[PDB]
Amino acid sequence: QVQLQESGPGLVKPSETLSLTCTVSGGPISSYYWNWIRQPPGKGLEWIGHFYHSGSTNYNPSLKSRVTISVDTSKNQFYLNLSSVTAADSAVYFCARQVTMIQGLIDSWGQGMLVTVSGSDIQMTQSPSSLSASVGDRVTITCQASQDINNSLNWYQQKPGKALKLLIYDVSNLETGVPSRFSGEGSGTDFSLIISSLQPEDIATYYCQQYEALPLTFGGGTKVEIK
């Protein structure tokens, strides 16, 4: 399978550029979308940008004036260079693979690496922040978009100490291998991820994500635990 691995300095001085590398294995850079996403400690997922179609880039307008994403097809790697860096840029940085923007799901995520620094957006309101439930309980996690996003919504699962993985795409479609107790509902601006009967293996943080418009945006996340 295609595997992504971040590498680079874990500590960056404010006088240096934050510079990371993602080594891709099991498949080529080719014409795919190669993303950088970050998660400041305790904060949500923020899409930085992607290199795609063998030469083009889309950057988040919040970071656009200080970001570069490039590739080296001979090394099968892609890079992030984030300058004018401050403590606000301390985050776990993830590299992630995406096949299309037509169906804007992220199908492969790197494990992520901590890097410590020494209005037009579609806002995704995900609720609750955290949830504690018993085995066999019904769990409903909601995602509310500030703008109509039709069916351009995906859900990811991040089990403890694991990479984020696609759970549901295009509102209600289950990713291969996902158990039937998961389902997704909604349209327009209102969406829900439902676990009909919570199992111990479902302890994870869940995230919704919109691809109706750029920048790509994610919900703040929902940590699910057993009580």
């Binding site: 498949g27 080719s30 795919y32 096949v99 923007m101």
Partner: peptide
């Protein structure tokens, strides 16, 4: 072209 390139990526992704 952007749409065509996405269909190409979709098919080649499964092919690989």
């Amino acid at each position: 072209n952007k749409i065509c390139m996405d269909m190409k990526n979709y098919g080649t992704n499964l092919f690989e």
